Design a protein around this ligand. Structure first.
Ligand SMILES: Cc1nc2ccccc2nc1CCc1nc(-c2ccccc2)cn1-c1ccccc1
Ligand SMILES: [Mg+2]
Ligand SMILES: [Zn+2]
Length: 313
C-alpha cells in the first residue's frame, strides 16, 4: 500500500521521455513496468501480488525470438506510458488500466513469423483466425493468463467495467495488425481535416487508440539513432529467417525477407518511414499535440537513413 517502486535517478528522469531505452538488464524490466502502472494509473489500480504474478506469466509466454520478444513488449508499454502521461486528462480510468496491459500483452507467444507465412504454411492458427491471425492469438493468450488462479488483476472491477476493459484490450491488440493501420489512419486524417473528429464518439476513440497502438508498436523509429539502427538488425533477423522458410516452402519471398537483398535495407527503411512511420506520428501529433517529440525523433531517423544511402555512414 505505502510501497512505491523507485528507479535510479537517470532512469527516474529519462523514463518520462518518449526516446527512453529500457536497457539490457532484463531483471529490471518488471520493476520498470510496475513503476509505469503506478504513476499513470495509481498504486491502487492493481493488487501488487496479482500484478507481479501476471507480469511474470506474460514474460514466460514471450519466446526467445530476435525482435518480437519480452523487451519489445516492455518497450511498446513504455511508449504508451509516455503518451498517457503527456495527455493526462484525455483518457478514462479504465483506458489507463487497459492500454499498458494491452501493450505488455500485444505480441504474446509470437513465433517471429508474419500472418502471411502462417497462411502459406497452413498453420492451425490460420484456420482458427482468417484475418489478423497472430493478433487474435495474442488476445487469446491474454485472456488465458488473466484466468489463471491469482492472475486476475481486474477482479475489483464490476462485471460491465470488466467487459469494457477486455474490449479496450481486444481492439488495442487487433489494431497492432499493420494491415489495418492504413485505413484507420486515412479515416482519422479525413475526420480531423473535415473537423468531424469527436472524442465522445466511442467509435472515434477506438480509432485514436488504434493509432496510439501503431505509434507504440513502431516506436523503434523514435529512439536515438544507435538504438534505431541496432533494433533494425533484430527486425531483419526475423524477416530473413521467414524468407528462408518461404524458400523452404518453394516460394521466392518478397525482397524485405530475402537476406540475399540485405544491400537494399536503407531504401526499404526510407519507404517505411515515408509510407508508414511519418504518416503515423503526423496524424497522432494532429490529434494529440504533446506526442510531437515522436514525430520529431522519427524525422531525425529518416534523415539518418538518408545519410546511410549517401554513404556518409
Ligand atoms: C516492416 C518493418 N517494420 C519496422 C518496424 C519498426 C522499425 C523498422 C521496421 N522496418 C520494417 C521493414 C521496412 C521495409 N524494409 C523493406 C526492404 C528491405 C530490404 C530489401 C527490400 C525491402 C521494405 N520495407 C517496407 C517499405 C514500405 C512499407 C512496408 C515495408
Ligand atoms: Mg504484433
Ligand atoms: Zn509488436
Amino acid at each position: 500500500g505505502l510501497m512505491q517502486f523507485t528507479l535510479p535517478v537517470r532512469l527516474c528522469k529519462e523514463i518520462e521521455l518518449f526516446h527512453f531505452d529500457i536497457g539490457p538488464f532484463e531483471n529490471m524490466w518488471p520493476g520498470i513496468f510496475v513503476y509505469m502502472v503506478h504513476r499513470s494509473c495509481g498504486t491502487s489500480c492493481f493488487e501488487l501480488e496479482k500484478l507481479c504474478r501476471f507480469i511474470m506469466s506474460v514474460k514466460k509466454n514471450y519466446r526467445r525470438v530476435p525482435y518480437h520478444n519480452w523487451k519489445h513488449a516492455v518497450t511498446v508499454a513504455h511508449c504508451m506510458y509516455a503518451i498517457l502521461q503527456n495527455n493526462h486528462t484525455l483518457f478514462t480510468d479504465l483506458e489507463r488500466k487497459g492500454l499498458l496491459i494491452a501493450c505488455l500483452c500485444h505480441d504474446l507467444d509470437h513465433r517471429g513469423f508474419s500472418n502471411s507465412y502462417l497462411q502459406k504454411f497452413d498453420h492451425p492458427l490460420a484456420a482458427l483466425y482468417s484475418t489478423s491471425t497472430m493478433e487474435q492469438h495474442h488476445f487469446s493468450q491474454t485472456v488465458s493468463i488473466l484466468q489463471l488462479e491469482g492472475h486476475n488483476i481486474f477482479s475489483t472491477l464490476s462485471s460491465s467495467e470488466y467487459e469494457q476493459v477486455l474490449e479496450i484490450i481486444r481492439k488495442a491488440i487487433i489494431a497492432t495488425d499493420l494491415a489495418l493501420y492504413f485505413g484507420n489512419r486515412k479515416q482519422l486524417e479525413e475526420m480531423y481535416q473535415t473537423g468531424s473528429l469527436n472524442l465522445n464518439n466511442q467509435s472515434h476513440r477506438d480509432r485514436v487508440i488504434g493509432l496510439m497502438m501503431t505509434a507504440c508498436d513502431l516506436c523503434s523509429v523514435t529512439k536515438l539513432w544507435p538504438v534505431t539502427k541496432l533494433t533494425a538488425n533484430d527486425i531483419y533477423a526475423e524477416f530473413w529467417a521467414e524468407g528462408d522458410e518461404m524458400k523452404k516452402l518453394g516460394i521466392q519471398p518478397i525482397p524485405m525477407m530475402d537476406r540475399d537483398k540485405k544491400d537494399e535495407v536503407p531504401q526499404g527503411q526510407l519507404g517505411f518511414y515515408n509510407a508508414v512511420a511519418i504518416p503515423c506520428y503526423t496524424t497522432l501529433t494532429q490529434i494529440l499535440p504533446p506526442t510531437e517529440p515522436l514525430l520529431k525523433a522519427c524525422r531525425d531517423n529518416l534523415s539518418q537513413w538518408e545519410k546511410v544511402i549517401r554513404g556518409e555512414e
